[PDB]
Scaffold this motif. Structure first.
Motif, PDB file in Angstrom:
ATOM      1  N   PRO C 216      42.847  29.670  50.086  1.00  0.00           N
ATOM      2  CA  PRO C 216      42.981  30.355  48.783  1.00  0.00           C
ATOM      3  C   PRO C 216      41.896  29.864  47.831  1.00  0.00           C
ATOM      4  O   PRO C 216      41.456  28.716  47.926  1.00  0.00           O
ATOM      5  CB  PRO C 216      44.340  29.864  48.254  1.00  0.00           C
ATOM      6  CG  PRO C 216      45.022  29.238  49.441  1.00  0.00           C
ATOM      7  CD  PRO C 216      43.886  28.634  50.261  1.00  0.00           C
ATOM      8  N   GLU C 217      41.496  30.711  46.861  1.00  0.00           N
ATOM      9  CA  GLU C 217      40.534  30.309  45.837  1.00  0.00           C
ATOM     10  C   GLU C 217      41.184  30.481  44.472  1.00  0.00           C
ATOM     11  O   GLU C 217      41.796  31.554  44.283  1.00  0.00           O
ATOM     12  CB  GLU C 217      39.280  31.234  45.932  1.00  0.00           C
ATOM     13  CG  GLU C 217      38.288  30.863  44.828  1.00  0.00           C
ATOM     14  CD  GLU C 217      37.000  31.654  44.898  1.00  0.00           C
ATOM     15  OE1 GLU C 217      36.393  31.547  45.941  1.00  0.00           O
ATOM     16  OE2 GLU C 217      36.551  32.345  43.969  1.00  0.00           O
ATOM     17  N   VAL C 218      41.054  29.490  43.606  1.00  0.00           N
ATOM     18  CA  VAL C 218      41.736  29.574  42.298  1.00  0.00           C
ATOM     19  C   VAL C 218      41.519  30.913  41.609  1.00  0.00           C
ATOM     20  O   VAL C 218      42.453  31.612  41.232  1.00  0.00           O
ATOM     21  CB  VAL C 218      41.199  28.491  41.370  1.00  0.00           C
ATOM     22  CG1 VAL C 218      41.719  28.675  39.938  1.00  0.00           C
ATOM     23  CG2 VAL C 218      41.586  27.115  41.909  1.00  0.00           C
ATOM     24  N   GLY C 219      40.251  31.281  41.510  1.00  0.00           N
ATOM     25  CA  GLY C 219      39.943  32.455  40.689  1.00  0.00           C
ATOM     26  C   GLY C 219      40.396  33.729  41.341  1.00  0.00           C
ATOM     27  O   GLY C 219      40.667  34.705  40.648  1.00  0.00           O
ATOM     28  N   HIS C 220      40.486  33.796  42.667  1.00  0.00           N
ATOM     29  CA  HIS C 220      40.843  35.068  43.305  1.00  0.00           C
ATOM     30  C   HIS C 220      42.288  35.443  43.049  1.00  0.00           C
ATOM     31  O   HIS C 220      42.634  36.609  42.753  1.00  0.00           O
ATOM     32  CB  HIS C 220      40.601  34.986  44.821  1.00  0.00           C
ATOM     33  CG  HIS C 220      39.124  34.869  45.117  1.00  0.00           C
ATOM     34  ND1 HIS C 220      38.623  34.721  46.392  1.00  0.00           N
ATOM     35  CD2 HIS C 220      38.050  34.844  44.287  1.00  0.00           C
ATOM     36  CE1 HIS C 220      37.300  34.623  46.304  1.00  0.00           C
ATOM     37  NE2 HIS C 220      36.913  34.703  45.047  1.00  0.00           N
ATOM     38  N   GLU C 221      43.178  34.439  43.157  1.00  0.00           N
ATOM     39  CA  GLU C 221      44.565  34.849  42.834  1.00  0.00           C
ATOM     40  C   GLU C 221      44.719  35.162  41.351  1.00  0.00           C
ATOM     41  O   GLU C 221      45.534  36.005  40.954  1.00  0.00           O
ATOM     42  CB  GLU C 221      45.609  33.768  43.171  1.00  0.00           C
ATOM     43  CG  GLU C 221      45.554  33.300  44.628  1.00  0.00           C
ATOM     44  CD  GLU C 221      45.909  34.385  45.628  1.00  0.00           C
ATOM     45  OE1 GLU C 221      47.063  34.849  45.634  1.00  0.00           O
ATOM     46  OE2 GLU C 221      45.028  34.739  46.406  1.00  0.00           O
ATOM     47  N   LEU C 246      38.102  25.498  45.071  1.00  0.00           N
ATOM     48  CA  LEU C 246      38.437  25.163  43.693  1.00  0.00           C
ATOM     49  C   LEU C 246      37.379  25.685  42.738  1.00  0.00           C
ATOM     50  O   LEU C 246      36.197  25.495  43.005  1.00  0.00           O
ATOM     51  CB  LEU C 246      38.529  23.633  43.529  1.00  0.00           C
ATOM     52  CG  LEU C 246      39.575  22.988  44.428  1.00  0.00           C
ATOM     53  CD1 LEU C 246      39.438  21.473  44.443  1.00  0.00           C
ATOM     54  CD2 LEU C 246      40.977  23.359  43.963  1.00  0.00           C
ATOM     55  N   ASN C 247      37.784  26.330  41.642  1.00  0.00           N
ATOM     56  CA  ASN C 247      36.828  26.804  40.645  1.00  0.00           C
ATOM     57  C   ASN C 247      37.637  27.229  39.404  1.00  0.00           C
ATOM     58  O   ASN C 247      38.808  26.843  39.329  1.00  0.00           O
ATOM     59  CB  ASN C 247      35.965  27.953  41.123  1.00  0.00           C
ATOM     60  CG  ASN C 247      36.709  29.190  41.577  1.00  0.00           C
ATOM     61  OD1 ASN C 247      37.911  29.347  41.351  1.00  0.00           O
ATOM     62  ND2 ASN C 247      36.045  30.117  42.290  1.00  0.00           N
ATOM     63  N   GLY C 248      37.060  27.988  38.493  1.00  0.00           N
ATOM     64  CA  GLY C 248      37.822  28.410  37.325  1.00  0.00           C
ATOM     65  C   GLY C 248      37.558  29.880  37.009  1.00  0.00           C
ATOM     66  O   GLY C 248      36.559  30.461  37.415  1.00  0.00           O
ATOM     67  N   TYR C 254      35.952  40.398  36.494  1.00  0.00           N
ATOM     68  CA  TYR C 254      35.076  40.084  37.626  1.00  0.00           C
ATOM     69  C   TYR C 254      35.249  38.611  38.028  1.00  0.00           C
ATOM     70  O   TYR C 254      35.655  37.813  37.186  1.00  0.00           O
ATOM     71  CB  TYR C 254      33.608  40.402  37.266  1.00  0.00           C
ATOM     72  CG  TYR C 254      33.034  39.414  36.270  1.00  0.00           C
ATOM     73  CD1 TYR C 254      33.338  39.481  34.906  1.00  0.00           C
ATOM     74  CD2 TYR C 254      32.210  38.390  36.709  1.00  0.00           C
ATOM     75  CE1 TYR C 254      32.803  38.552  34.018  1.00  0.00           C
ATOM     76  CE2 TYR C 254      31.668  37.437  35.830  1.00  0.00           C
ATOM     77  CZ  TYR C 254      31.976  37.544  34.495  1.00  0.00           C
ATOM     78  OH  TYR C 254      31.454  36.610  33.617  1.00  0.00           O
ATOM     79  N   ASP C 255      34.930  38.297  39.281  1.00  0.00           N
ATOM     80  CA  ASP C 255      35.064  36.926  39.826  1.00  0.00           C
ATOM     81  C   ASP C 255      34.049  36.017  39.164  1.00  0.00           C
ATOM     82  O   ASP C 255      32.863  36.126  39.494  1.00  0.00           O
ATOM     83  CB  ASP C 255      34.859  37.037  41.346  1.00  0.00           C
ATOM     84  CG  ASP C 255      35.098  35.761  42.136  1.00  0.00           C
ATOM     85  OD1 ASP C 255      36.009  34.971  41.826  1.00  0.00           O
ATOM     86  OD2 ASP C 255      34.382  35.534  43.133  1.00  0.00           O
ATOM     87  N   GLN C 256      34.465  35.117  38.253  1.00  0.00           N
ATOM     88  CA  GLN C 256      33.499  34.312  37.537  1.00  0.00           C
ATOM     89  C   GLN C 256      33.000  33.088  38.309  1.00  0.00           C
ATOM     90  O   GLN C 256      31.852  32.660  38.096  1.00  0.00           O
ATOM     91  CB  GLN C 256      34.140  33.821  36.220  1.00  0.00           C
ATOM     92  CG  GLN C 256      34.497  35.001  35.294  1.00  0.00           C
ATOM     93  CD  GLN C 256      34.840  34.386  33.946  1.00  0.00           C
ATOM     94  OE1 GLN C 256      35.927  33.806  33.767  1.00  0.00           O
ATOM     95  NE2 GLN C 256      33.910  34.463  33.008  1.00  0.00           N
ATOM     96  N   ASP C 257      33.842  32.492  39.143  1.00  0.00           N
ATOM     97  CA  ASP C 257      33.489  31.296  39.889  1.00  0.00           C
ATOM     98  C   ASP C 257      32.969  30.203  38.963  1.00  0.00           C
ATOM     99  O   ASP C 257      31.926  29.565  39.205  1.00  0.00           O
ATOM    100  CB  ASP C 257      32.442  31.643  40.966  1.00  0.00           C
ATOM    101  CG  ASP C 257      33.112  32.358  42.130  1.00  0.00           C
ATOM    102  OD1 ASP C 257      34.319  32.721  42.173  1.00  0.00           O
ATOM    103  OD2 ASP C 257      32.364  32.640  43.098  1.00  0.00           O
ATOM    104  N   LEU C 258      33.708  29.927  37.875  1.00  0.00           N
ATOM    105  CA  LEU C 258      33.259  28.863  36.968  1.00  0.00           C
ATOM    106  C   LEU C 258      33.514  27.504  37.584  1.00  0.00           C
ATOM    107  O   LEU C 258      34.246  27.417  38.562  1.00  0.00           O
ATOM    108  CB  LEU C 258      34.053  28.903  35.648  1.00  0.00           C
ATOM    109  CG  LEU C 258      33.939  30.236  34.870  1.00  0.00           C
ATOM    110  CD1 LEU C 258      34.839  30.242  33.649  1.00  0.00           C
ATOM    111  CD2 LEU C 258      32.506  30.499  34.430  1.00  0.00           C
TER     112      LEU C 258
HETATM  113 NI    NI Z   1      35.368  33.830  43.596  1.00  0.00          NI
END
Ligand code: NI
Ligand SMILES: OC[C@]1(O)OC[C@H](O)[C@@H]1O
Ligand SMILES: OC[C@]1(O)OC[C@H](O)[C@@H]1O
Ligand SMILES: OC[C@]1(O)OC[C@H](O)[C@@H]1O
Ligand SMILES: OC[C@]1(O)OC[C@H](O)[C@@H]1O
Ligand code: NI
Ligand code: NI
Ligand code: NI
Ligand code: NI
Ligand code: NI
Ligand code: NI
Ligand code: NI
Lengths: 388, 388, 388, 388
Positions: C216-221, C246-248, C254-258
């Motif tokens: 799982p990716e934080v931002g995707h859910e 892990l990201n924000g 849109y998927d920011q991937d911070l």
């Molecule tokens: Ni992403």
């Protein structure tokens, strides 16, 4: 160090907040009703500065003129007993079934005339209690379907209503200003004037725009996925932030009205930073609902936490801005240059300035990093109290 | 009956729409570049009225003044050959790395001066080609983090930039107006002036507000979960709908720019109903991307479908409003009463009208159903062509 | 006290993260490409444990078998020189135009066969480099329109592909497991297996479900508005959390991937609390993009901040759980009772227990407050380091 | 031609739908309560096949065993009088204050035991009335804050509850199956098992998974921004679509429960296409609320429109699939190839097939357009009845 509020911090609460009985669209009340006098006394003990009310929170709908005077006198004695103030009031134009298609923009003309008279009656009462701001939240102004509401005619009706209210307060000589509170949806499918921007634009078409500003709520702009500190900045830039409703919201869903600090915590940090650096001097009003899981001890805990979280974030935002390493980072990211005029030299000198186009080195400019991530990690460290 | 477009229907397309090569944040281009001349010719064959452009779509970035004149002359000959018009143009202040922190509100002052000169250069070219509207989409004006952008200073810089552009066109005597195109996010984390309401409010603070309106895009307001026909109604009410970008969007996510009619189909129905009933006479511009799954035959199919869907929905909305059963339903839901003033009799007569409060039967009024569901099912039947 | 990472903290980064050149759907690259060897060296200096890669990040698409061996040997020497590990790898089935309609569920059968061969080739390479987890993100598996993809046939094709990959690794004797990475949308309009729940359900229909888990990716859910710690809890409950990204992310857009810690900070707190209390022992992998505003100094700053924020939140979550006042609050909110079986006595004794229905005092039970707001304010005080 | 429903179309309605009195979180009821007998009679007249109920809709909470038998007998006589069936029933574990922190996953163990006994009591009644499906919507299972609910312990409690209910129906010999109805939020801040995927995954961990499926609702998956027809396809692929709730929703916001066909109309088209092409044979149940603007004539209009819109969309989806031009377009977009196995030849032959990798022409494959936009415009023309 100690995050104890005092009336000087200007924290205020609506009667309807701590007094929410916990009824939601799927369940019955979980708490008994609170007597307004009891709420005033408990909030004073917690360090609040004042309370706000809808007409129907204070005087139950349908009350006789004599029952009315009785409810008000008891309230006024609690205010006198505690030192609490009443800086804002508002009208309930959303609970009674007669308002099912709106108050000011109801399709039925007789309902629109009733909504104005119910409003005017409470403006008089608010002035008597010393309120400086009168809020309007048009919770039922809107539609679930496209043909039900011609929105140009409805904006005409909305303008007509606010123009008449402005005529009323100016003819009576009252020192009160109006604040429109936007919300994008809920309980109507779409609500008119759904964001701070739509409300600000609308105000400029009123006959006496100087009497009207906005009362934004944290969670309402977040229900549209918008950045609340940015919208507050635009309201401050326009000179129209007359009041503010503080609470928390976890993204785009139903209006949660969580206690302030819950929800998007970093947005709360940046909001407090902005309010305190801009010198906002109005009330810090919490429009929140203690969750229906709570008994009355949890209601007071939740109200206290609103105030506590504001004061922690105020301390962290002040530490951030006062830190010399942050001030250096702000210059490294050229926030000082953002505040300088682009072209104080004027249009003609801009056109003749070859360094602005013909001889501008775009590749050199493009390679300059903005250094925003180091600045943002300094802000994170300050928020978390992790500076060492 | 036959949904064939003609140049009289005023359909226009940006060069960048059919010419999108299909590069997205996760993948390479799937189509080769299109020569602008080729797009003009193909769009004319499909029945379009005209095309629009960013400076960099027509003249590749960095072109010499001589290469520039050559690109323009070829373009102008295609326009002459086909009868196509150029009603709008705009500036690319978002693709080049120098614009990574914005054009008009970049923190670096030298970038802001360059952005204005690049803009002014293309305004001259647009007037030469006969454009009546100049669009500005501040795609990079905004921030990913709170400390990177003081939004009050950035709005000052934004105001300064538009004021200078207005000074420029008035000093040159040009007959062109400006249209700001809002978007809430993407590519920046939050974009300034994120919705039609924020843009309308901002315009009222410019020195010559009459030169500026909005260019709303269907999908951008839907990225904030807002009702696009409602926002268009507010823009029309304010007299500021100078242009419009038509496309489709499936809810709150990345900007899809689907062909018009895709996405929220009922909102498209209600938008066309509003535009045609309000007599909007500007271009019906499609700002869309044919999906990168498509080859060039699919690009032209998608462009044709934009026009086709507008004309089907126009026919269905006209049939709806012309249906006597619908007109009766509108009266049953009191849309006629919404259009009547609430209080043409004035404030004093409202206050003395006992039928508006003291003797208003609120229970009788509350029991009246609004009949909106029968009205909305008539609109559904008309949209689906299921009236019999 | 000191939030310095060491390789023992198991922090890992994809090559594509720090190496993102900043190309977005509206703009050109702002940074030059990084040599993989250079990234390995810089990340080691920062305290990372290892790196991950897509096949095409390490070996440019189309490379000859000899160029391939050369790229790998240089990489392997950097790993040997630094002590860095390669715990996960994955395949790029999304960038090349041939994958425009998907890899495993492309409508064209020859593309699906190519996608499997490209995948198998890189599984061999990953095992050689010592990876224990092979991630699959089906970024192009999905559709922009309803008729383009029969989703039952596409799930059949997806199952067929993962079954064949499981057959392959078991026949080769490899000790590697698969992790499916869900995402709800972007770049396709809707992506198949859009959330952790859909992926977990799908895995149960594979022939050898024990070889497959989720990444799982934080931002995707959060792009679906879901609670990421809750989804991770469900993945842990099922025994399927094989890896994590892990990201924000700031809400639904849109998927920011911070960088990790940015975005929803309280959700990051509760995620770290859960991972550390459940004893998750896999890599803490950051799948993030340093914003394109940054130069390379900002890239390394952003990568360091990922690690720093994890370690601050780990300290605060441990302080929360170790605080005796918090442990008392957890009992006051009956978290101890949640962990006790409802009916260890069995069905028949439940049915004969009159205290569970006939003589249950529902009014007494209903009046008990849950005390969750006091518990949540203790968690806020711990997060902010405001306990005194 | 004529879109008249008959009981053969299997349309069903909950008692709570047409009987919703219009109370919302901001306003009082606008309609009086309906006697269940009256609803059964009116729905039969409209062409419905049957009705569904929560225990508390039929038998008011706290009723004596004798009042209970009386309410049931009157109901049963209305069913006998009209020919109406009762294919599904469910339990109200959300309205009473005792369920404020959940029923099956309440932190208090005595509440969890009460919730199971209240459930078992109504399963017996449902079987008596002939229901084949028992729905469970865990509306209060969830949390507003992170520490209030350990989600692994709560899933253990949820599993324990459904396992006990399965033990109960198997020991009693009943022919009834269970359907879990997911919802992502509202009334709790986050609800456990928030989407169809999470529910499907959970079911695979129950002791007797064959007794459990899903009851998805259109608007609930759309509250997470997900594609409902895609989730239904996944549920059908798994063999778990035991029932379905049909209604409409305008994007990500509070649960609107509009009539079916309202909201996202194209998603409704693609849903009906899927249900009818997959041969779903269960009830087409509407879980909707007639808006509180309506009187009882509008309630029946709204209920009739649910059925009407299903039958129009069924006709248009059948015309789409039967059109030879559409069948040719489906082949042009290679939907036929999606349905063919990728590698029926097996793993070893795939590895030895040089045409799948070594000699695959990726550039030729990449250039092939998918033709999805022409296919989607054919589907739009069919939906709008614009084929000529
Ligand atoms: Ni992403
Ligand atoms: O947010 C809505 C609210 O709680 O009720 C109306 C008043 O304006 C207050 O802000
Ligand atoms: O929507 C953005 C866009 O495609 O690029 C900028 C121009 O204004 C156009 O509308
Ligand atoms: O999130 C998508 C990503 O960055 O690219 C694919 C790989 O799985 C990685 O997680
Ligand atoms: O959607 C929730 C609902 O209306 O109440 C519970 C029952 O399952 C029904 O679906
Ligand atoms: Ni609110
Ligand atoms: Ni408010
Ligand atoms: Ni767009
Ligand atoms: Ni646009
Ligand atoms: Ni990832
Ligand atoms: Ni619902
Ligand atoms: Ni339902």
């Amino acid at each position: 160090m100690n995050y104890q509020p005092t009336p000087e911090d200007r924290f205020t609460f609506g009667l309807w907040t701590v007094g929410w009985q916990g009824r939601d669209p799927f369940g019955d009340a979980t708490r008994r009703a609170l007597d307004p006098v009891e709420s005033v006394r408990r909030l004073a003990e917690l360090g609040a500065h004042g309370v706000t009310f809808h007409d129907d929170d204070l005087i139950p709908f349908g009350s006789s003129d004599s029952e009315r005077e009785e409810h008000v006198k008891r309230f006024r004695q609690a205010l006198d007993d505690t030192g609490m103030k009443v800086p804002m009031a508002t009208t309930n134009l959303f609970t009674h079934p007669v308002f099912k298609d709106g108050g000011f923009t109801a399709n039925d003309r007789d309902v629109r005339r009733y909504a104005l008279r119910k409003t005017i009656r409470n403006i008089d009462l608010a002035v008597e209690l010393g309120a400086e701001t009168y809020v309007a939240w048009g919770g039922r102004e809107g539609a679930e379907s496209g043909g039900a509401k011609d929105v140009r005619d409805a904006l005409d009706r909305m303008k007509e209503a606010f123009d008449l209210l402005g005529e009323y307060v100016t003819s009576q000589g009252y020192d009160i200003r109006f604040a429109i509170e936007p919300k994008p949806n809920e309980p109507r499918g779409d609500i008119l004037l759904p964001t701070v921007g739509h409300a600000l634009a609308f105000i400029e078409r009123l006959e006496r725009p100087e009497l009207y500003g906005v009362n934004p709520e944290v969670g309402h702009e977040q229900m549209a996925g918008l950045n609340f500190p940015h919208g507050i900045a635009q309201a401050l830039w326009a000179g129209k932030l007359f009041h503010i409703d503080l609470n928390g919201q976890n993204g785009i869903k139903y209006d949660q009205d969580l206690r302030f600090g819950a929800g998007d915590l970093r947005a709360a940090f940046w909001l407090v930073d902005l309010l305190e650096s801009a010198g906002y001097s109005g009330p810090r009003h919490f429009d929140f609902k203690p969750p229906r899981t709570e008994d009355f001890d949890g209601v007071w805990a939740s109200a206290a936490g609103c105030m506590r979280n504001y004061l922690i974030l105020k301390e962290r935002a002040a530490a951030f801005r006062a830190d010399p390493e942050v001030q250096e980072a702000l210059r490294a990211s050229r926030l000082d240059e953002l505040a300088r005029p682009t072209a104080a030299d004027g249009l003609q000198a801009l056109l003749d300035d070859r360094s602005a186009f013909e001889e501008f080195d775009v590749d050199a400019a493009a390679a300059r990093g903005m250094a925003f991530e180091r600045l943002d990690q300094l802000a994170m460290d300050h928020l978390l109290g992790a500076r060492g």
